[PDB]
Design a protein around this ligand. Structure first.
Ligand SMILES: [Mg+2]
Ligand SMILES: [Mg+2]
Ligand SMILES: [Mg+2]
Lengths: 351, 353
């Protein structure tokens, strides 16, 4: 693991975007986390959900807490109900995100069943499409369409990843093709605009623009931040950075530099474009960018604490800047699970 | 002002050389037979009373649209069956025709998902016709390729929605142009529709197919953009093409925008050849026939007006000009067919009957 370069790149990003999280007071944070967790926990504990969603209890629990954090930390302006419903949707996607399964058999009659209104054969689709209305009720038709497309894309992306194919050497378009596919970019981007707070028709151009630009910023930031948890992980391996290596036949070092440059430029344009636009829009965008980073630095899923410990000592400016940022984020989002994530889904299921 | 004829010619010849544009075993008689078969089934389809009443399109525009699409399909999907060419011609005609609607989708999309999940007919009449006909297209493909057609068509619908706003992007919104082009490009629909299950094993060639979709998406939309650059140059009605959006969103000159497209198009062409040259022969054949047929369609369909360029430089002693004309003659030689030879009777005649 290029620890030395991981610190280099991460520091460049955090410093360039001027990472800082003022999204909530600690009381507000805990309050939202618990609300979202509580509703989702009861949802996933239902027998039907327990029966069709094939996932290890411990894994479901960890996935739910990771997503509640992501939603609460990054969608700081939407209502508690919206955070909760979104948390359920993104927990379904995270579960699929780490899974190993062959969709082929259950996708043979996908369209015909869809058109006829018959329950989907793939259990994931059966649960996701049944729950979807609870998510879409928060948005106008345009944003809703984006959520639907992006989730369908994501499903295809996880399907492709099952083949552990990083692209044919020379297939330069493959890496980003897959990343957009599995990125859930338009879903995340469009889910930032609840109709309760934003009028889809009045802000059509800014929202469309935000979806287009946020898609890349969002995915790339995760490619960089999650570069650590991914790397020695089997389910991953097939990633933008590693596919850049195989497909464009370049060095991991160059791949990371490529990713970092794109990310910095994406950040740059986010500012240029939205700085002088509707204040409410800029506010939501800012809350997302900052909270999104706080989430990557704190959440267990990305285990960046491991890199903190190993680097906490050595003083190389680059290593010190990382720990500073890591500490700053921890001071805001390092909330203990016992303060909000209870009771466990399992306990509610066996009730 | 003034169309960059030189640069255009150079890029075009380069494009055709990179893709190895050359004669094939696909004859004029075969084309005519396929053209008429696809046109005949599609014409009868669109002439049905239900189609006639729900699809709001001027009859002459529909006639012209169907003819251009049938040509595009018959020429580019050279390896698929007559039925497949016919069914894809209907689908791509539905997509082309949606660009004629200026009606805000908002009202008909408010209950999109609930109706979809419940199996109730969609409120937007276009979805009603398209989703009803889709099985005829999908029956030709496996589940993976099918999913791709479904997604791409859904994206296309959103793409048409966004375009009603005549928005080329905010200055500084560098990621907007390609975001929109991919939305309205039908890249994955095209890419995945090149592999009927009757001719290819989706699972066995998953890697080849997935890679083709990824690479063909960009090659196809960019070649359409490049070849359409001439007809769109002074079209004051067409305001939001990829190139014009590059100008607005990236704040660069039309020339630079054109350069960007050229570089992407040429590079894409090279990598297509490089990647698939050594793979399965049938796969490479389908891919090569698409590229050549797609180019032949652009050179032969008058909507692109490329004849005006050929006519303007057919007597120059320049290398590029000469190479262009030879390619053009190659194209016309096998692709220049009179509509009277296959596109009959008109859809309207079949409709009033
Ligand atoms: Mg993933
Ligand atoms: Mg993942
Ligand atoms: Mg990742």
């Amino acid at each position: 693991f290029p620890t030395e370069y991981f610190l280099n790149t991460t520091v460049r990003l955090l410093e360039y975007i001027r990472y800082r999280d003022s999204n909530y007071t600690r009381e507000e944070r805990i309050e939202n986390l618990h609300y979202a967790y509580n509703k989702a926990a009861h949802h996933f504990a239902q027998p039907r959900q327990q029966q069709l969603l094939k996932v290890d209890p411990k894994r479901l629990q960890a996935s739910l807490q990771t997503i509640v954090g992501m939603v609460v930390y990054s969608w700081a302006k939407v209502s508690k109900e919206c955070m909760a419903d979104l948390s359920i949707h993104y927990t379904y996607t995270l579960v699929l995100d780490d899974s190993k399964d062959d969709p082929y058999p259950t996708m043979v009659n996908y369209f015909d069943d869809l058109q006829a209104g018959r329950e989907q054969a793939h259990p994931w689709w059966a649960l996701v499409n049944e729950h979807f209305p609870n998510v879409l009720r928060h948005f106008g038709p345009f944003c809703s369409l984006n959520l639907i497309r992006s989730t369908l894309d994501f499903f295809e992306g996880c399907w492709i990843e099952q083949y552990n194919f990083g692209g044919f050497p020379g297939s330069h378009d493959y890496p980003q093709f897959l990343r957009r596919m599995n990125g859930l970019g338009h879903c995340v981007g469009a889910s930032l605009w609840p109709k309760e707070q934003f009028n889809e028709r009045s802000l059509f151009l800014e929202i469309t623009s935000a979806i287009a630009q946020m898609e890349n910023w969002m995915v790339w930031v995760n490619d960089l931040m999650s570069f650590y948890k991914e790397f020695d992980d089997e389910r991953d391996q097939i990633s933008l950075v590693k596919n850049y290596v195989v497909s464009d036949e370049i060095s991991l070092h160059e791949a990371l530099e490529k990713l970092t440059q794109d990310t910095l430029h994406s950040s740059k344009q986010m500012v240029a474009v939205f700085s002088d636009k509707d204040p409410q829009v800029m506010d939501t965008i800012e809350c997302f960018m900052h909270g999104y980073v706080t989430w990557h630095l704190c959440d267990r899923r990305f285990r960046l604490s491991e890199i903190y410990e190993k680097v906490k000592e050595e003083k190389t400016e680059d290593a010190q800047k990382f720990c500073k940022f890591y500490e700053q984020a921890a001071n805001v989002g390092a909330v203990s699970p016992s303060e909000w994530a209870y009771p466990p889904v399992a306990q509610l299921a066996n009730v």
